[PDB]
Design a protein around this motif. Structure first.
Motif, PDB file in Angstrom:
ATOM      1  N   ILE A 106      41.211  32.272  40.885  1.00  0.00           N
ATOM      2  CA  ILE A 106      41.342  33.674  41.272  1.00  0.00           C
ATOM      3  C   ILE A 106      40.097  34.434  40.804  1.00  0.00           C
ATOM      4  N   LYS A 107      39.524  35.298  41.643  1.00  0.00           N
ATOM      5  CA  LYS A 107      38.331  36.102  41.329  1.00  0.00           C
ATOM      6  C   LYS A 107      38.835  37.284  40.495  1.00  0.00           C
ATOM      7  N   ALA A 108      39.066  36.996  39.218  1.00  0.00           N
ATOM      8  CA  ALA A 108      39.651  37.945  38.284  1.00  0.00           C
ATOM      9  C   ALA A 108      38.655  38.562  37.325  1.00  0.00           C
ATOM     10  N   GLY A 109      38.836  39.863  37.130  1.00  0.00           N
ATOM     11  CA  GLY A 109      38.004  40.674  36.256  1.00  0.00           C
ATOM     12  C   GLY A 109      38.814  41.194  35.087  1.00  0.00           C
ATOM     13  N   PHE A 110      38.127  41.375  33.963  1.00  0.00           N
ATOM     14  CA  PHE A 110      38.672  41.894  32.725  1.00  0.00           C
ATOM     15  C   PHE A 110      37.875  43.149  32.419  1.00  0.00           C
ATOM     16  N   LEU A 111      38.595  44.264  32.298  1.00  0.00           N
ATOM     17  CA  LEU A 111      38.014  45.564  32.001  1.00  0.00           C
ATOM     18  C   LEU A 111      38.380  45.800  30.551  1.00  0.00           C
ATOM     19  N   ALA A 112      37.395  45.720  29.667  1.00  0.00           N
ATOM     20  CA  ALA A 112      37.576  45.916  28.230  1.00  0.00           C
ATOM     21  C   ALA A 112      37.456  47.384  27.894  1.00  0.00           C
ATOM     22  N   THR A 113      38.144  47.822  26.841  1.00  0.00           N
ATOM     23  CA  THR A 113      38.135  49.225  26.419  1.00  0.00           C
ATOM     24  C   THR A 113      37.811  49.472  24.951  1.00  0.00           C
ATOM     25  N   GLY A 114      37.431  48.402  24.255  1.00  0.00           N
ATOM     26  CA  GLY A 114      37.081  48.405  22.846  1.00  0.00           C
ATOM     27  C   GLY A 114      36.058  47.333  22.521  1.00  0.00           C
ATOM     28  N   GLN A 115      35.573  47.407  21.292  1.00  0.00           N
ATOM     29  CA  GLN A 115      34.594  46.495  20.707  1.00  0.00           C
ATOM     30  C   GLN A 115      34.840  45.022  21.057  1.00  0.00           C
ATOM     31  N   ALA A 156      33.503  44.180  32.663  1.00  0.00           N
ATOM     32  CA  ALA A 156      33.170  45.599  32.664  1.00  0.00           C
ATOM     33  C   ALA A 156      33.906  46.308  31.532  1.00  0.00           C
ATOM     34  N   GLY A 157      33.555  47.574  31.334  1.00  0.00           N
ATOM     35  CA  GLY A 157      34.185  48.407  30.325  1.00  0.00           C
ATOM     36  C   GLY A 157      33.304  49.120  29.323  1.00  0.00           C
ATOM     37  N   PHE A 198      42.453  43.084  35.086  1.00  0.00           N
ATOM     38  CA  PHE A 198      43.347  43.190  33.941  1.00  0.00           C
ATOM     39  C   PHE A 198      42.679  44.209  33.024  1.00  0.00           C
ATOM     40  N   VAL A 199      43.343  45.339  32.809  1.00  0.00           N
ATOM     41  CA  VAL A 199      42.813  46.445  32.022  1.00  0.00           C
ATOM     42  C   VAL A 199      43.374  46.420  30.614  1.00  0.00           C
ATOM     43  N   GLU A 200      42.479  46.275  29.643  1.00  0.00           N
ATOM     44  CA  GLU A 200      42.866  46.258  28.248  1.00  0.00           C
ATOM     45  C   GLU A 200      43.325  47.658  27.860  1.00  0.00           C
ATOM     46  N   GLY A 201      44.593  47.836  27.501  1.00  0.00           N
ATOM     47  CA  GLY A 201      45.058  49.149  27.093  1.00  0.00           C
ATOM     48  C   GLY A 201      44.496  49.520  25.738  1.00  0.00           C
ATOM     49  N   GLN A 202      44.647  50.788  25.374  1.00  0.00           N
ATOM     50  CA  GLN A 202      44.243  51.362  24.088  1.00  0.00           C
ATOM     51  C   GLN A 202      45.336  52.315  23.616  1.00  0.00           C
ATOM     52  N   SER A 215      38.650  59.266  31.756  1.00  0.00           N
ATOM     53  CA  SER A 215      39.121  58.808  33.065  1.00  0.00           C
ATOM     54  C   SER A 215      37.955  58.501  34.008  1.00  0.00           C
ATOM     55  N   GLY A 216      36.868  59.269  33.943  1.00  0.00           N
ATOM     56  CA  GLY A 216      35.712  59.040  34.812  1.00  0.00           C
ATOM     57  C   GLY A 216      34.996  57.718  34.595  1.00  0.00           C
ATOM     58  N   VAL A 217      34.872  57.313  33.340  1.00  0.00           N
ATOM     59  CA  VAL A 217      34.224  56.068  32.971  1.00  0.00           C
ATOM     60  C   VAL A 217      35.059  54.860  33.393  1.00  0.00           C
ATOM     61  N   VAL A 218      36.377  54.983  33.263  1.00  0.00           N
ATOM     62  CA  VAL A 218      37.290  53.911  33.619  1.00  0.00           C
ATOM     63  C   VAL A 218      37.289  53.786  35.139  1.00  0.00           C
ATOM     64  N   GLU A 219      37.218  54.901  35.859  1.00  0.00           N
ATOM     65  CA  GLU A 219      37.165  54.865  37.313  1.00  0.00           C
ATOM     66  C   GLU A 219      35.914  54.107  37.751  1.00  0.00           C
ATOM     67  N   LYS A 220      34.771  54.401  37.133  1.00  0.00           N
ATOM     68  CA  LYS A 220      33.528  53.715  37.502  1.00  0.00           C
ATOM     69  C   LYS A 220      33.606  52.201  37.284  1.00  0.00           C
ATOM     70  N   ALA A 221      34.168  51.789  36.154  1.00  0.00           N
ATOM     71  CA  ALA A 221      34.258  50.373  35.844  1.00  0.00           C
ATOM     72  C   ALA A 221      35.158  49.639  36.822  1.00  0.00           C
ATOM     73  N   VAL A 222      36.246  50.260  37.261  1.00  0.00           N
ATOM     74  CA  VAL A 222      37.157  49.613  38.211  1.00  0.00           C
ATOM     75  C   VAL A 222      36.521  49.480  39.602  1.00  0.00           C
ATOM     76  N   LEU A 223      35.760  50.486  40.018  1.00  0.00           N
ATOM     77  CA  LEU A 223      35.107  50.439  41.316  1.00  0.00           C
ATOM     78  C   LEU A 223      33.950  49.443  41.250  1.00  0.00           C
ATOM     79  N   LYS A 224      33.309  49.298  40.093  1.00  0.00           N
ATOM     80  CA  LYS A 224      32.212  48.345  39.928  1.00  0.00           C
ATOM     81  C   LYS A 224      32.812  46.967  40.177  1.00  0.00           C
ATOM     82  N   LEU A 225      33.896  46.618  39.483  1.00  0.00           N
ATOM     83  CA  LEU A 225      34.533  45.300  39.697  1.00  0.00           C
ATOM     84  C   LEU A 225      34.956  45.057  41.156  1.00  0.00           C
TER      85      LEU A 225
END
Lengths: 337, 339
Positions: free
Chosen positions: B188-197, B206-207, B238-242, B219-229
Motif C-alpha cells: 500500500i502507498k502509505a504515508g505517515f504524517l508525524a507531529t512531534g520529534q 511529512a510533518g 496515518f496522522v500521529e495525534g498529539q 491547522s494550516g501546516v497540517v493541511e499543507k502536509a496532507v496535500l503534499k502526501l
C-alpha cells in the motif's frame, strides 16, 4: 513579558502611527486607541495627511486629534511615545514605518509596536544609542510553561467574550463591559489577547496568536492569575477566532481552557454565509453550535448573545454593547452567581 | 520546506544520544529509533554506559546497538550524524548534551535535534557548524514562511486516518507507526504524517513539531502536509495525534491537528487505568474515552471506528484493537481503506 502599566505613568501622551492605512479597515489599532485608549493619552496621529483631523478619516471617536506627517511635529506636541497603529502592511509601507520608528527612537521617544518585521538590530542600536526603547508586544516571553492547573483554583470571576468568527466585535464588547464596570466602581480587569487590546491599556494579556501552540492555555492562565493577585474582582477576556473556525479554533480552545470562564457572552454577525476571508471553507459561523461547543468543552455558561449589526433568533437574550442598559444588565448578571 | 529524506540518503549511519535518560521514560525518541528508524541506520547509542548494549536498558528493540560513552567512539564506528534522542532534561544534562553536539560538529558529523536549547547554546552551535562544513538540522523550529488553513483540505482525495488518544503518552505514535509499517509491507502507498520529534526522526513522509508552531498556523501546516502526501501519490495517510481535546494544557494542539487533517476515520488510543492526565495531578480532570470520542465526532466529520489499548481492555460499543496484533492491524487497515 512587558507590562505597559509597569513602564508608563497613566495619561502618558502618545503619537499613533496610521501611515498608509488611515481610513481603511487595516488601521484597527489606531481606531481602538482613539475610541478607548485608557493608559496612553492620544496627542496626534502620524500619517501622510498634513492639516486634517482624525475625525476626517474615522468617525465616531473619543479622542479627536490632529494628523501630522512627521515624528518631529509629534514631539513638538508633547508626544513621549510612538505607538504603531497599522496592521500587516506591504514591504514598502513597512519600510516607511521602520523609518518613523528610527526617528522616534532618535528623538528621545519610546516606541510601542506589535508589528512583525529583521530590523531589530538597528532598532536596538538606535534605542541604546539614544537612550530610548523599542517595546515589542508581539514577541512572546522566552520563559514559558504550559498550563499546570492553577486556573481550576481561581477565585476571580471570569467572563469570556467569545464570537462565532473573527472581527465581529469581541474586543469592542469586552472593552465596553470593562469601562462600564470601572465607572460603577467595580474592580474590573481586562485580559487582552491581541495587539489592540494591549495598547488600549489592558490590565494583562499577550498577543496569543504568536505564542507557540503548546503554551497558549498556560500564558492565559498566568494572565488571569496576575489580575487576581492585583485585586481585581472580575475579568473580561478578549476572545480570538471561534471554536468552529477551521483556521483558528485551536487558538480559541487554548483561550477557553486557559481562562476557565464562569460565564460567556457570544458575539455574532448573522449575515455571514462564510467565515470572513475564507470563501473556500464550506462552513459558516453558527451561534447555537458555537454556544453548544463552548458549554460542552468547559464549565462556562453562555448567558447572552451580542450583536453589533442585526439581531438573530435564540433563547438567550441578545445584547447591544453600545446600549448602557444592556451593559448594566450584562454586568449585573455576570456577578449574580 | 524541511524534509530529512531530501537531506540524508536512506541508511545514513547515526549515533543516537540518550545521555542521562537511558532506561527511563524520557528517552522515548531513542526508543522510537531503535524500534522503527526507517531513514537512519542506528549504529550506536551515546550514553554514559561504556560496554553495554541498548538491549540491557530497553527491550524489545529492532536495532540492538552498542552503548558508547563518547562521540569519538561513535565516529570510529562510521556514524555520520548525531541524533538527539532525549526529552526535556535538566539544565545540567542539557549542558552535557550541548558538549556532545559541539564535539560531533567538530568531528565532521551533522547533528539532528528537536530539543529546545538556550540561545547561547544555539548561537554557539551555528558558529561551530559553519566552520567544519557540517550542519545542525533543527526539526523543532517551525518554518518562517507560514500561512493559516485556506480550505484545500476539504478538496482532498487522499484517505486520512487520524490516530488520536484520550491523553498524551498512550501509544498514538506507536499505533500510527505499526499501521504504516503494515500497510507498506502489504504494498500500500502509505504515508505517515508525524507531529512531534520522534515521528519525524523515525522517517515520517511529512510533518512538523506542531506544538512549537504559533497557535494560528497549526491547522494550516497540517493541511499543507496532507496535500503534499496526496500530490506525491500516496493513497492513505496515518496522522500521529498529539495530546487530547479534553487535555487542558494541550487540547488546542489536538484541535488544530483535527481541523488541519480533516480525517475520514479515527482510531482512539486509550489507557483506562489513568485517574488523571499523565503528569498533571493538579488538574481535576482525567482521560475519558466516550467523551473524547464524542468531541472528535461533534467537531469534525471523522468517525471514530475503533478503540486501541496497549494495557487492558475497556467497555465500549466500538471494537478495541491491540496494535501489536497482526489481525488487528489488518482489520484496522482494511476498515480504513474500504471506508
Amino acid at each position: 513579558h512587558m507590562d505597559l502599566w509597569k513602564l508608563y505613568q497613566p495619561g502618558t501622551p502618545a503619537a499613533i502611527v496610521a501611515w498608509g492605512q488611515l481610513g481603511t479597515a487595516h488601521a484597527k489599532t489606531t481606531y481602538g486607541l482613539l475610541r478607548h485608549s485608557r493608559l496612553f493619552k492620544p496627542v496626534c496621529v502620524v500619517a501622510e495627511h498634513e492639516g486634517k483631523m482624525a475625525s476626517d478619516f474615522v468617525k465616531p471617536v473619543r479622542y479627536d486629534v490632529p494628523v501630522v506627517s512627521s515624528v518631529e511635529k509629534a514631539k513638538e506636541m508633547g508626544a513621549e511615545v510612538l505607538i504603531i497603529g497599522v496592521s500587516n502592511p506591504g514591504g514598502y509601507l513597512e519600510e516607511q514605518i521602520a523609518t518613523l520608528v528610527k526617528k522616534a527612537l532618535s528623538l528621545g521617544m519610546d516606541v510601542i509596536s506589535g508589528l512583525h518585521f529583521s530590523q531589530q538590530t538597528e532598532f536596538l542600536k538606535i534605542a541604546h544609542e539614544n537612550g530610548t526603547r523599542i517595546i515589542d508586544i508581539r514577541i512572546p516571553p522566552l520563559e514559558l510553561d504550559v498550563l499546570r492547573g492553577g486556573i481550576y483554583r481561581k477565585k476571580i470571576k471570569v467572563v469570556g467574550v467569545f464570537g462565532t468568527d473573527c472581527v465581529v466585535g469581541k474586543r469592542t464588547t469586552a472593552v465596553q463591559l470593562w469601562e462600564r464596570a470601572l465607572e460603577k466602581g467595580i474592580k474590573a480587569g481586562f485580559l487582552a489577547t491581541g495587539q489592540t487590546g494591549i495598547l488600549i491599556g489592558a490590565d494583562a494579556g499577550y498577543v496569543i496568536d504568536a505564542v507557540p501552540a503548546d503554551f497558549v492555555s498556560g500564558v492565559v492562565e498566568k494572565a488571569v492569575l496576575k489580575l487576581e493577585k492585583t485585586g481585581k474582582e472580575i475579568v473580561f477576556v478578549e476572545g480570538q477566532g471561534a471554536l468552529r473556525h477551521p483556521a483558528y479554533g485551536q487558538v480559541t480552545l487554548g483561550l477557553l481552557y486557559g481562562s476557565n470562564p464562569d460565564v460567556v457572552f457570544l458575539v455574532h454577525d448573522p449575515s455571514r454565509d462564510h467565515f470572513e476571508s475564507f470563501p473556500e471553507i464550506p462552513k459558516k459561523p453558527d451561534f447555537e453550535e458555537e454556544r453548544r461547543l463552548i458549554e460542552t468543552l468547559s464549565n462556562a455558561k453562555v448567558i447572552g448573545g451580542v450583536s453589533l449589526n442585526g439581531g438573530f433568533e435564540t433563547d438567550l437574550p441578545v445584547y447591544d454593547p453600545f446600549n448602557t442598559d444592556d451593559l448594566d444588565e450584562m454586568l449585573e448578571r455576570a456577578m449574580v452567581w
